[PDB]
Amino acid sequence: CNPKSVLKRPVTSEELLTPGAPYARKTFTIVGDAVGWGFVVRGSKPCHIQAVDPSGPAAAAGMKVCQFVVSVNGLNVLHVDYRTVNNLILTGPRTIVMEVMEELEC
Amino acid sequence: XXXXXXXXXXXXXXXXXXXXXXXXXXXXXXXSTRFYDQLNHHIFELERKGGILAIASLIGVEGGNATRIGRFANYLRNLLPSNDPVVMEMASKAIGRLAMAGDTFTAEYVEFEVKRALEWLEGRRHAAVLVLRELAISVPTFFFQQVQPFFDNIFVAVWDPKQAIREGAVAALRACLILTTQRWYRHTFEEAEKGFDDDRIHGALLILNELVRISSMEGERLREEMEEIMGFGTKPRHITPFTXXXXXXXXXXXXXXXXXXXXXXXXXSLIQMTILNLLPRLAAFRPTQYLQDTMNHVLSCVKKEKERTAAFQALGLLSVAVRSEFKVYLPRVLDIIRAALPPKVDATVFTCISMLARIQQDIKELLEPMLAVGLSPALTAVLYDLSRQIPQLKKDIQDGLLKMLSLVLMHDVGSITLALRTLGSFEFELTQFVRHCADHFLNSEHKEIRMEAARTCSRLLTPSVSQTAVQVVADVLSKLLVVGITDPDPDIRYCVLASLDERFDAHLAQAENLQALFVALNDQVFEIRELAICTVGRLSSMNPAFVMPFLRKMLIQILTELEHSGIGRIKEQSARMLGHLVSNAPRLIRPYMEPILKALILKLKDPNP
């Protein structure tokens, strides 16, 4: 019971890949901060966003909790582990280019 | 410094004049007090531009003081009642700089100007407006002290038939509503709609935009960035060197703007100026009937002149806001762009092609007239951000763009400077060009060309196995070292020395290059000397056999200049220099720490800050 899971959607693999229908893609560019970006991604295959700091810069520029990401700073990370993406975001520049699936209330 | 500085003070009141005031501010950095008050009064009474340059510059640097505030307050209070144009705006900026000094008299001085500003609400009315606008930016607290008089007097004075008031008073109402939103709105909309019901047209639209623009910055953030057009994982050095009604009435603000999108088609350039800025940001909140009233005024102004500059900017915001429905108006918008470019103003055309995609494969064909326009900072910033947002053919962008660079860098002065900025601004994919550029900077008497061409070559050597390539880099870096040692202009020496980054330490560590660097340790400029010992100290691990004997001689000299020279500056410079040695060459200095520490303790027990 040690891990925590807040994502209602069980799996989105191939559900996202299909064009149109449930979601509309959006690209979010987040600038680095002295206190950090303040977001966590804990999706195995789809790498869904686990939590977002409400007072952080990400929450100011949208970035709601119920989202999925497929590409970071240009590189497409649709099918990798969340920790591997966590390595990429830390090793990348201060400003991060992020694509959010942003399901439309479905 | 009384009469000799009065000779340049009279030459400042009579390009060089702005530099004479900049040198006065620089003279205030090093700096009797009575003579400066008399010299400021001498320039005041005579001319008024140099007097404001004398007052404001000294107050900022020398520091606000009770004596200085009590005297110069009377001078500033005299200028405002009656003054010439241009001089008035300079005197109002000198108020803002005084009000941001952070003194005890600031509470009295600011509230003295604000109370008199409310009395007025034409060199009297516009002066009070510039005072309230700058105080709203600089001082939010005391600007909020009088909010109820603020709105009531201003909504009367704004709608008078004047242009200078309408330009400034809306920026004051803008500065006020930003402070009000972060912390009235009913009294604003009431007086605005009363005023709207042809001078009383273009003012209401700015007020209506206040509810739309502040509630949604998303519209402004795109326009604000186009108008202008490190790493977290780095390891620190082991030795630390010393250091509501705005959204509910949003569409309503547009509903009163939609009627003001076709009513004032062609009245009286001034009214059209306010319409063409606001319409895209109002539509960006809620886009077609609103657009149709926008499109009638905006599209007609693009063909016309004196507005074409703002016309594409409004259309560029409109292109991002209206995504799908804009495809109907593709033949209308694209025909003006295809006609506007051949004449070469068009700096906006490229910015909006970036904002138009912000897409189709047609844009690939649209590049060949776009590039034929000419080298501009907007075009190359766009094409860089074009490959950022839509990297469908990043290679084809770089393929065509390099063909442009080849034509440019094969064959006046300020363009080649910007052409080097072009070559050096954004990423690219250059051997012959750089070996030919090694001739140009040597054979150019232009200071700015040499200073920029240096930035270029050091940047284009970032890929740093073929022996010939190494020998070429060695040749280029040898030419740079020669320029960095022998060039008279220390600015060029400053750029070159700064350009010798971590990347080049493999090349600088060569024996021949290190013998040049040693000569550089006897440079006229101490700061370059400082930076050189840092580079040499950093290389003392790579080639200690050469570097450590040479730093030992330098160490003795540093301690000699410290102990035996009886001069503050030289001793001060020597300590600073020994600082850079300790940090950059710690191995050398550890065995000799006890001598150094005794010398430093003796300096601590000496009887300049």
XYZ file of C-alpha atoms in Angstrom:
715
model
C 0.000 0.000 0.000
C 3.110 2.182 0.026
C 2.638 3.753 -3.450
C -0.188 6.203 -4.097
C -2.181 6.308 -7.346
C -4.510 9.219 -8.129
C -5.283 8.493 -11.799
C -8.792 7.187 -12.469
C -8.025 6.164 -16.060
C -6.539 2.638 -15.825
C -4.656 2.661 -19.149
C -4.463 5.065 -22.083
C -1.915 3.189 -24.223
C -3.223 3.266 -27.830
C -6.244 5.208 -26.590
C -4.200 8.393 -27.002
C -2.344 7.334 -30.169
C -5.630 7.276 -32.092
C -6.204 10.753 -33.577
C -9.057 12.895 -32.349
C -11.866 11.739 -30.022
C -11.236 11.912 -26.261
C -8.552 14.604 -25.869
C -7.055 17.680 -27.523
C -3.284 18.058 -27.402
C -1.609 21.106 -25.884
C 2.025 22.148 -25.486
C 3.116 23.709 -22.190
C 6.433 25.530 -21.801
C 7.487 25.746 -18.147
C 10.327 28.009 -17.018
C 12.621 26.860 -14.244
C 12.411 28.310 -10.760
C 14.652 28.599 -7.725
C 12.241 26.345 -5.807
C 11.818 23.938 -8.737
C 9.046 23.196 -11.201
C 6.954 21.314 -8.642
C 5.396 18.495 -10.679
C 5.589 14.696 -10.545
C 4.883 12.160 -13.307
C 4.105 8.598 -12.195
C 2.634 6.885 -15.258
C 4.303 3.661 -16.329
C 3.451 3.589 -20.045
C 1.611 6.913 -20.644
C 3.564 8.906 -18.029
C 0.595 10.728 -16.540
C 1.195 13.709 -14.277
C 0.931 12.576 -10.665
C 0.731 15.914 -8.843
C 1.307 19.619 -9.466
C 2.241 22.301 -6.954
C -0.729 24.724 -6.846
C 1.538 27.678 -6.020
C 4.228 26.682 -8.516
C 4.820 28.143 -11.961
C 3.331 25.060 -13.634
C -0.072 25.538 -11.994
C -0.059 29.169 -13.130
C 0.400 27.989 -16.731
C -2.377 25.416 -16.635
C -0.820 22.013 -15.906
C -3.697 20.276 -14.156
C -3.202 16.980 -12.337
C -5.328 14.844 -14.687
C -3.051 15.006 -17.721
C -0.815 12.772 -19.820
C 2.477 13.620 -21.503
C 4.087 12.154 -24.610
C 6.965 14.530 -25.443
C 9.367 16.597 -23.338
C 11.594 19.417 -24.664
C 10.941 18.149 -28.177
C 11.932 14.530 -27.589
C 8.960 12.161 -27.754
C 8.592 10.124 -24.554
C 5.232 8.503 -25.300
C 6.507 4.991 -24.407
C 9.112 5.060 -21.618
C 9.118 4.687 -17.853
C 8.233 7.657 -15.664
C 11.634 7.531 -13.960
C 13.364 7.625 -17.345
C 11.389 10.773 -18.162
C 12.373 12.087 -14.733
C 16.006 11.638 -15.746
C 15.423 13.556 -18.984
C 13.688 16.527 -17.347
C 16.441 16.908 -14.743
C 19.266 16.546 -17.281
C 17.559 19.027 -19.612
C 17.577 22.826 -19.559
C 15.974 24.979 -16.892
C 13.020 25.724 -19.183
C 11.086 22.587 -20.141
C 8.829 22.148 -23.177
C 6.027 19.754 -22.226
C 3.051 18.366 -24.150
C -0.093 17.655 -22.111
C -2.821 15.309 -23.338
C -5.453 17.347 -21.442
C -8.507 15.106 -21.556
C -11.694 17.121 -22.124
C -13.722 15.998 -19.105
C -14.235 12.478 -20.445
C 36.482 70.169 -9.285
C 34.659 73.488 -8.928
C 35.452 75.525 -12.041
C 37.083 72.823 -14.167
C 33.937 70.704 -13.901
C 31.920 73.859 -14.566
C 33.492 73.982 -18.027
C 32.023 70.601 -18.960
C 28.809 71.470 -17.123
C 28.317 74.451 -19.430
C 29.187 72.213 -22.381
C 26.516 69.788 -21.175
C 23.799 72.446 -21.084
C 24.894 73.830 -24.454
C 25.173 62.472 -28.227
C 28.011 64.285 -26.458
C 25.609 66.055 -24.095
C 24.060 62.786 -22.917
C 27.581 61.429 -22.444
C 28.531 64.567 -20.517
C 25.697 63.777 -18.109
C 26.650 60.097 -18.070
C 30.181 61.160 -17.148
C 28.699 63.348 -14.414
C 26.866 60.332 -12.998
C 30.138 58.416 -13.267
C 31.780 61.313 -11.435
C 29.136 60.871 -8.740
C 30.266 57.261 -8.357
C 33.720 58.414 -7.263
C 32.214 61.368 -5.401
C 32.787 69.940 -1.955
C 29.109 69.246 -1.245
C 28.252 72.948 -1.265
C 29.921 73.488 -4.648
C 27.833 70.699 -6.190
C 24.636 72.344 -4.928
C 25.775 75.658 -6.418
C 26.753 73.964 -9.689
C 23.336 72.296 -9.890
C 21.682 75.657 -9.189
C 23.867 77.335 -11.831
C 22.636 74.938 -14.520
C 19.030 75.012 -13.262
C 18.327 78.744 -13.562
C 19.774 78.900 -17.088
C 19.530 74.420 -20.659
C 16.663 72.934 -18.656
C 17.515 69.534 -20.150
C 21.050 69.698 -18.767
C 19.674 70.871 -15.433
C 17.461 67.803 -15.073
C 20.407 65.647 -16.153
C 22.472 67.264 -13.389
C 19.851 66.895 -10.643
C 18.526 63.381 -11.270
C 21.895 61.748 -11.993
C 23.606 63.048 -8.847
C 20.658 62.227 -6.569
C 20.584 58.603 -7.720
C 24.297 57.921 -7.230
C 25.400 60.261 -4.434
C 22.295 59.123 -2.544
C 19.192 60.920 -1.328
C 19.852 62.864 1.869
C 17.857 65.201 4.093
C 19.956 68.153 2.925
C 19.708 67.134 -0.739
C 15.964 66.442 -0.567
C 15.097 69.736 1.124
C 17.023 71.773 -1.448
C 16.223 69.957 -4.705
C 12.528 69.592 -3.808
C 12.078 73.320 -4.431
C 13.761 72.980 -7.834
C 11.425 70.163 -8.895
C 8.386 72.037 -7.559
C 9.315 75.018 -9.759
C 9.624 73.103 -13.049
C 6.168 71.502 -12.992
C 3.871 74.607 -12.991
C 5.317 75.875 -16.290
C 7.810 74.125 -18.561
C 8.479 73.258 -22.189
C 7.662 69.906 -23.804
C 10.202 67.064 -23.606
C 11.695 68.858 -20.597
C 8.396 68.189 -18.806
C 8.654 64.417 -19.270
C 12.280 64.488 -18.103
C 11.263 66.399 -14.967
C 8.501 63.860 -14.294
C 11.006 61.003 -14.579
C 13.240 62.830 -12.089
C 10.299 62.730 -9.667
C 9.958 58.966 -10.087
C 13.669 58.420 -9.482
C 13.502 60.615 -6.371
C 10.384 58.797 -5.148
C 12.130 55.416 -5.498
C 15.158 56.576 -3.484
C 13.645 55.202 -0.273
C 13.979 58.139 2.125
C 11.887 59.371 5.037
C 10.824 62.487 3.103
C 9.403 60.240 0.357
C 6.140 59.964 2.302
C 5.748 63.752 2.283
C 7.101 64.374 -1.229
C 4.942 61.735 -2.941
C 1.731 62.740 -1.156
C 2.509 66.401 -1.871
C 2.577 65.709 -5.618
C -0.457 63.399 -5.498
C -2.638 65.922 -3.653
C -1.768 68.664 -6.147
C -2.290 66.207 -9.015
C -5.881 65.628 -7.883
C -6.473 69.395 -7.814
C -5.699 69.789 -11.526
C -7.672 66.697 -12.557
C -1.447 72.120 -21.187
C 1.672 71.620 -19.092
C -0.275 71.379 -15.827
C -2.729 68.546 -16.507
C -0.327 66.289 -18.417
C 2.369 66.819 -15.775
C 0.092 65.582 -12.982
C -0.789 62.562 -15.132
C 2.860 61.590 -15.628
C 3.425 62.018 -11.883
C 0.531 59.711 -10.978
C 1.481 57.128 -13.621
C 5.122 56.864 -12.536
C 4.175 56.854 -8.846
C 1.681 54.050 -9.488
C 4.510 51.956 -10.936
C 7.210 52.947 -8.444
C 5.088 53.395 -5.300
C 2.003 51.139 -5.090
C 1.286 51.859 -1.413
C 0.899 55.648 -1.407
C -0.746 55.518 -4.838
C -3.538 53.485 -3.212
C -3.846 56.096 -0.443
C -6.081 58.282 -2.674
C -8.213 55.990 -4.848
C -11.654 57.600 -4.474
C -10.385 61.051 -5.553
C -8.371 59.300 -8.280
C -11.277 57.782 -10.225
C -13.735 60.650 -9.728
C -11.517 63.469 -11.009
C -9.929 61.474 -13.843
C -13.158 60.231 -15.447
C -14.048 63.907 -15.915
C -10.663 65.049 -17.237
C -10.005 62.115 -19.599
C -13.005 62.789 -21.830
C -12.047 66.407 -22.494
C -11.087 67.038 -26.153
C -7.336 66.521 -25.836
C -4.810 64.019 -27.181
C -1.870 64.232 -24.761
C -4.221 63.602 -21.829
C -5.870 60.598 -23.502
C -2.453 59.033 -24.139
C -1.180 59.401 -20.573
C -4.307 59.247 -18.419
C -5.288 55.825 -19.763
C -1.807 54.575 -18.880
C -2.443 55.957 -15.394
C -5.845 54.246 -15.309
C -4.032 51.153 -16.569
C -1.464 51.451 -13.774
C -4.304 51.917 -11.281
C -6.510 49.021 -12.405
C -3.542 46.645 -12.249
C -3.051 47.623 -8.605
C -6.812 47.392 -8.040
C -7.077 43.949 -9.654
C -4.193 42.475 -7.648
C -5.696 43.789 -4.401
C -14.368 51.030 -8.095
C -14.990 48.688 -11.020
C -18.663 49.690 -11.017
C -17.734 53.385 -10.992
C -15.299 52.731 -13.853
C -17.804 51.011 -16.154
C -20.531 53.561 -15.374
C -18.396 56.582 -16.275
C -16.928 54.787 -19.299
C -20.298 53.857 -20.805
C -21.600 57.358 -20.070
C -18.635 58.714 -22.022
C -19.165 56.303 -24.913
C -22.799 57.376 -25.365
C -15.932 61.406 -32.016
C -13.388 62.268 -29.335
C -15.476 60.145 -26.937
C -14.975 56.850 -28.787
C -11.334 55.732 -28.684
C -11.180 56.238 -24.902
C -13.985 53.835 -24.005
C -12.333 50.997 -25.943
C -9.224 51.192 -23.758
C -11.397 51.016 -20.638
C -13.379 48.095 -22.057
C -10.081 46.346 -22.813
C -9.086 46.835 -19.162
C -11.596 44.177 -18.110
C -10.624 41.826 -20.964
C -6.847 42.282 -20.918
C -6.224 42.044 -17.169
C -8.614 39.109 -16.717
C -6.755 37.233 -19.484
C -3.034 37.939 -19.834
C -2.898 35.218 -22.518
C -3.739 37.860 -25.120
C -1.063 40.285 -23.930
C 1.724 37.718 -23.482
C 1.724 36.933 -27.208
C 1.681 40.588 -28.288
C 4.191 41.663 -25.632
C 6.792 39.132 -26.797
C 6.400 39.819 -30.527
C 6.767 43.578 -29.985
C 10.216 42.986 -28.486
C 11.206 40.863 -31.500
C 22.280 27.607 -17.433
C 21.437 24.231 -15.925
C 20.234 22.810 -12.632
C 22.670 19.878 -12.803
C 25.852 21.954 -12.924
C 28.356 21.091 -10.206
C 29.413 24.163 -8.186
C 33.110 24.894 -7.843
C 34.693 23.184 -4.848
C 36.196 26.517 -3.740
C 33.409 29.083 -3.484
C 34.478 32.524 -4.758
C 33.361 35.537 -2.764
C 30.161 37.160 -4.011
C -15.401 38.555 -11.780
C -16.523 41.837 -13.352
C -13.548 41.580 -15.713
C -14.783 38.277 -17.146
C -18.545 38.726 -16.721
C -18.256 42.010 -18.612
C -15.467 40.761 -20.868
C -17.670 39.909 -23.849
C -19.778 42.877 -22.763
C -16.626 44.959 -23.164
C -16.455 43.507 -26.656
C -20.156 44.081 -27.279
C -19.468 47.769 -26.690
C -16.366 47.310 -28.821
C -18.106 45.530 -31.677
C -20.224 48.634 -32.212
C -16.958 50.556 -31.927
C -15.399 48.384 -34.624
C -17.318 49.813 -37.577
C -18.750 53.105 -36.298
C -15.383 54.871 -36.280
C -14.206 53.616 -39.674
C -12.478 56.832 -40.742
C -12.886 59.687 -38.264
C -9.973 61.719 -36.896
C -5.684 58.586 -37.464
C -5.871 59.179 -33.714
C -9.126 57.273 -33.166
C -8.091 54.557 -35.636
C -4.874 54.023 -33.656
C -6.721 52.940 -30.510
C -9.154 50.711 -32.438
C -6.518 48.624 -34.244
C -4.607 47.753 -31.066
C -7.576 46.678 -28.950
C -9.711 44.607 -31.356
C -7.464 41.481 -31.467
C -7.113 41.203 -27.691
C -10.880 41.591 -27.261
C -11.518 38.907 -29.889
C -8.797 36.722 -28.348
C -11.015 36.355 -25.281
C -14.050 35.277 -27.339
C -13.814 34.979 -31.171
C -17.340 35.479 -35.769
C -19.686 38.469 -35.621
C -17.163 40.137 -33.317
C -14.434 39.296 -35.840
C -16.497 40.589 -38.769
C -16.771 44.003 -37.128
C -13.050 43.729 -36.379
C -12.142 42.518 -39.883
C -13.935 45.431 -41.556
C -11.844 48.051 -39.753
C -8.595 46.063 -39.481
C -8.406 44.687 -43.030
C -9.105 48.103 -44.547
C -6.302 49.661 -42.472
C -3.719 47.150 -43.735
C -3.880 48.473 -47.305
C -3.804 52.039 -45.966
C -0.732 53.751 -44.517
C 0.242 55.109 -41.066
C -1.439 52.009 -39.556
C -0.048 49.013 -41.540
C 2.531 48.608 -38.761
C -0.080 47.908 -36.074
C -2.391 46.258 -38.623
C -0.383 43.044 -39.006
C 0.239 42.937 -35.239
C -3.512 42.971 -34.609
C -3.934 40.376 -37.359
C -1.166 38.258 -35.829
C -3.011 38.119 -32.514
C -6.205 37.520 -34.495
C -4.508 34.674 -36.380
C -3.651 32.893 -33.126
C -7.064 33.600 -31.591
C -9.144 32.696 -34.663
C -7.656 29.319 -35.600
C -10.135 27.421 -37.789
C -12.484 30.217 -38.893
C -9.503 32.183 -40.241
C -9.151 29.675 -43.098
C -12.003 31.499 -44.851
C -9.953 34.726 -44.790
C -6.749 33.096 -46.078
C -6.975 34.633 -49.598
C -7.552 38.093 -48.101
C -4.658 38.058 -45.623
C -2.102 36.252 -47.793
C -2.575 38.540 -50.813
C -1.492 41.600 -48.806
C 1.584 39.762 -47.511
C 2.502 38.597 -51.018
C 2.219 42.218 -52.222
C 3.834 43.950 -49.225
C 7.174 42.102 -49.288
C 8.310 42.769 -52.924
C 8.744 46.532 -52.252
C 11.587 45.743 -49.834
C 7.474 48.064 -41.958
C 7.785 44.511 -43.283
C 9.480 43.524 -40.010
C 5.957 42.803 -38.760
C 5.082 40.628 -41.783
C 7.665 38.037 -40.744
C 6.607 38.185 -37.087
C 3.013 37.419 -38.089
C 3.987 34.546 -40.379
C 5.422 33.023 -37.207
C 2.192 33.919 -35.389
C 0.059 32.728 -38.319
C 1.323 29.173 -37.863
C 1.285 29.643 -34.077
C 1.643 25.726 -40.468
C 0.752 24.302 -43.859
C 3.247 22.975 -46.393
C 2.569 26.084 -48.500
C 4.773 28.041 -46.065
C 7.662 26.075 -47.591
C 7.054 27.885 -50.887
C 6.326 31.127 -49.004
C 9.943 31.161 -47.775
C 11.451 32.028 -51.175
C 9.860 35.529 -51.319
C 10.291 35.919 -47.561
C 14.059 35.392 -47.771
C 14.357 37.652 -50.836
C 13.209 40.610 -48.700
C 16.535 40.948 -46.900
C 18.459 40.468 -43.658
C 16.363 41.622 -40.705
C 16.489 40.633 -37.022
C 12.801 39.688 -37.176
C 13.208 37.278 -40.107
C 16.019 35.217 -38.582
C 14.324 35.242 -35.170
C 11.157 33.964 -36.863
C 12.846 31.242 -38.922
C 14.555 30.079 -35.729
C 11.243 30.038 -33.859
C 9.639 28.589 -36.994
C 11.859 25.511 -36.761
C 11.126 25.428 -33.019
C 7.332 25.321 -33.238
C 6.955 23.384 -36.499
C 10.088 21.239 -37.079
C 8.537 19.349 -39.992
C 11.470 20.207 -42.278
C 14.174 21.560 -39.993
C 16.744 20.340 -42.523
C 15.020 22.170 -45.387
C 14.977 25.331 -43.265
C 18.701 24.947 -42.588
C 19.283 24.014 -46.241
C 17.657 27.168 -47.609
C 18.873 29.399 -44.783
C 22.515 28.376 -45.280
C 22.134 29.332 -48.949
C 21.191 32.830 -47.776
C 24.180 32.934 -45.410
C 26.493 31.827 -48.224
C 25.398 34.729 -50.439
C 25.751 37.181 -47.537
C 29.080 36.044 -46.076
C 30.692 35.663 -49.509
C 30.353 39.295 -50.587
C 27.224 48.215 -45.505
C 28.840 48.211 -42.064
C 25.943 47.886 -39.635
C 24.432 45.068 -41.695
C 27.614 42.962 -41.630
C 27.663 43.539 -37.869
C 24.083 42.275 -37.681
C 25.002 39.605 -40.236
C 27.501 38.306 -37.684
C 24.741 38.479 -35.082
C 22.730 36.551 -37.668
C 25.474 33.942 -37.997
C 25.826 33.885 -34.198
C 22.266 34.253 -32.879
C 20.657 30.841 -33.431
C 21.995 27.391 -34.204
C 23.530 26.472 -37.558
C 25.339 23.677 -39.374
C 31.812 26.412 -41.785
C 35.581 26.072 -42.260
C 36.511 28.216 -45.277
C 34.236 31.056 -44.124
C 36.025 31.241 -40.768
C 39.529 31.048 -42.238
C 38.463 33.900 -44.525
C 36.960 35.749 -41.548
C 40.378 35.524 -39.879
C 41.556 37.952 -42.569
C 38.571 40.308 -42.314
C 38.860 41.232 -38.632
C 42.616 41.829 -38.926
C 42.068 44.010 -42.014
C 39.093 45.956 -40.600
C 39.558 49.329 -38.913
C 35.964 49.194 -37.629
C 35.927 48.593 -33.875
C 32.457 47.022 -33.902
C 33.305 44.554 -36.685
C 36.398 43.298 -34.844
C 34.435 43.027 -31.589
C 31.680 40.934 -33.201
C 33.807 38.814 -35.564
C 35.691 37.702 -32.447
C 32.432 36.492 -30.897
C 31.730 34.594 -34.131
C 34.936 32.563 -34.565
C 35.061 31.431 -30.927
C 31.423 30.298 -31.195
C 31.875 28.446 -34.494
C 34.714 26.393 -32.958
C 32.307 24.698 -30.539
C 32.915 21.269 -32.170
C 36.167 20.857 -30.252
C 40.000 12.853 -35.235
C 41.714 14.610 -38.148
C 45.089 16.308 -37.748
C 44.237 18.985 -40.326
C 41.186 20.152 -38.361
C 43.263 20.434 -35.176
C 45.965 22.408 -36.996
C 43.264 24.727 -38.364
C 41.802 25.342 -34.899
C 45.351 25.907 -33.639
C 45.929 28.430 -36.434
C 42.691 30.328 -35.765
C 43.312 30.349 -32.010
C 46.869 31.573 -32.600
C 45.491 34.534 -34.563
C 43.004 35.212 -31.756
C 45.763 35.112 -29.129
C 47.763 37.612 -31.198
C 44.749 39.940 -31.321
C 44.111 39.388 -27.613
C 47.680 40.428 -26.788
C 48.398 43.209 -29.283
C 45.089 44.936 -30.095
C 45.030 48.439 -28.549
C 41.261 48.518 -27.971
C 40.713 46.712 -24.633
C 37.051 46.095 -25.513
C 38.174 43.700 -28.253
C 40.627 42.241 -25.736
C 37.741 41.972 -23.253
C 35.522 40.021 -25.657
C 38.354 37.723 -26.771
C 39.480 36.974 -23.214
C 35.881 36.332 -22.145
C 35.444 34.075 -25.194
C 38.205 31.704 -23.982
C 35.800 29.366 -22.221
C 36.131 25.878 -20.723
C 35.771 24.565 -24.285
C 39.176 25.916 -25.340
C 41.251 24.820 -22.331
C 42.528 21.816 -24.305
C 43.937 24.200 -26.931
C 45.149 27.004 -24.647
C 47.179 24.384 -22.735
C 49.512 23.894 -25.716
C 53.112 24.949 -25.093
C 53.217 27.608 -27.822
C 49.867 29.085 -26.767
C 50.933 29.111 -23.106
C 54.061 31.130 -23.923
C 51.777 33.766 -25.454
C 49.513 33.754 -22.384
C 52.520 34.444 -20.137
C 53.173 37.700 -22.011
C 49.478 38.467 -21.467
C 50.000 38.392 -17.693
C 51.747 41.750 -18.184
C 48.709 43.429 -19.710
C 47.886 47.096 -19.196
C 44.355 46.220 -18.035
C 44.300 44.658 -14.569
C 40.962 42.918 -15.173
C 42.313 41.062 -18.205
C 45.379 40.230 -16.114
C 42.990 38.919 -13.448
C 41.191 36.765 -16.009
C 44.479 35.483 -17.452
C 45.856 34.206 -14.136
C 42.488 32.486 -13.693
C 42.958 30.734 -17.034
C 46.602 29.945 -16.261
C 45.700 28.771 -12.762
C 42.978 26.525 -14.166
C 45.531 24.949 -16.531
C 48.058 24.275 -13.735
C 46.758 20.707 -13.427
C 47.061 19.988 -17.155
C 50.662 21.213 -17.550
C 52.092 21.829 -14.059
C 55.671 21.483 -15.343
C 55.313 24.823 -17.144
C 52.594 26.565 -15.142
C 53.881 25.966 -11.602
C 57.366 27.491 -12.108
C 55.784 30.523 -13.777
C 53.165 31.070 -11.063
C 55.943 30.896 -8.456
C 57.649 33.942 -9.971
C 54.223 35.603 -10.123
C 53.514 34.630 -6.505
C 56.703 36.373 -5.358
C 55.732 39.457 -7.370
C 52.207 39.482 -5.910
C 53.623 39.299 -2.385
C 56.262 41.885 -3.311
C 53.655 44.336 -4.613
C 51.539 43.603 -1.532
C 54.251 44.022 1.104
C 56.634 46.559 -0.430
C 54.442 48.876 -2.518
C 53.094 51.623 -0.276
C 50.010 52.345 -2.383
C 46.374 51.481 -1.745
C 45.305 50.616 -5.288
C 48.309 48.423 -6.121
C 48.002 46.576 -2.810
C 44.234 46.321 -3.297
C 44.755 44.946 -6.808
C 47.427 42.556 -5.534
C 45.161 41.032 -2.875
C 42.404 40.576 -5.463
C 44.967 38.977 -7.780
C 46.223 36.663 -5.028
C 42.578 35.745 -4.504
C 42.292 34.486 -8.070
C 45.539 32.550 -7.622
C 44.392 30.730 -4.466
C 41.125 29.741 -6.138
C 42.531 28.692 -9.514
C 45.890 27.190 -8.417
C 45.321 25.699 -4.951
C 48.025 23.017 -5.207
C 50.836 25.554 -5.681
C 49.727 27.781 -2.810
C 49.117 25.202 -0.038
C 52.834 24.654 0.802
C 53.375 28.436 0.904
C 50.295 29.255 2.986
C 52.096 30.237 6.197
C 54.172 33.027 4.553
C 51.081 34.389 2.784
C 49.000 34.241 5.964
C 51.614 36.151 7.965
C 51.675 38.843 5.274
C 47.876 39.010 5.324
C 47.702 39.169 9.123
C 50.191 42.042 8.970
C 47.872 43.804 6.519
C 45.006 43.243 8.963
C 47.066 45.015 11.652
C 47.862 47.993 9.413
C 46.539 51.398 10.612
C 41.084 53.030 1.987
C 38.122 50.676 2.386
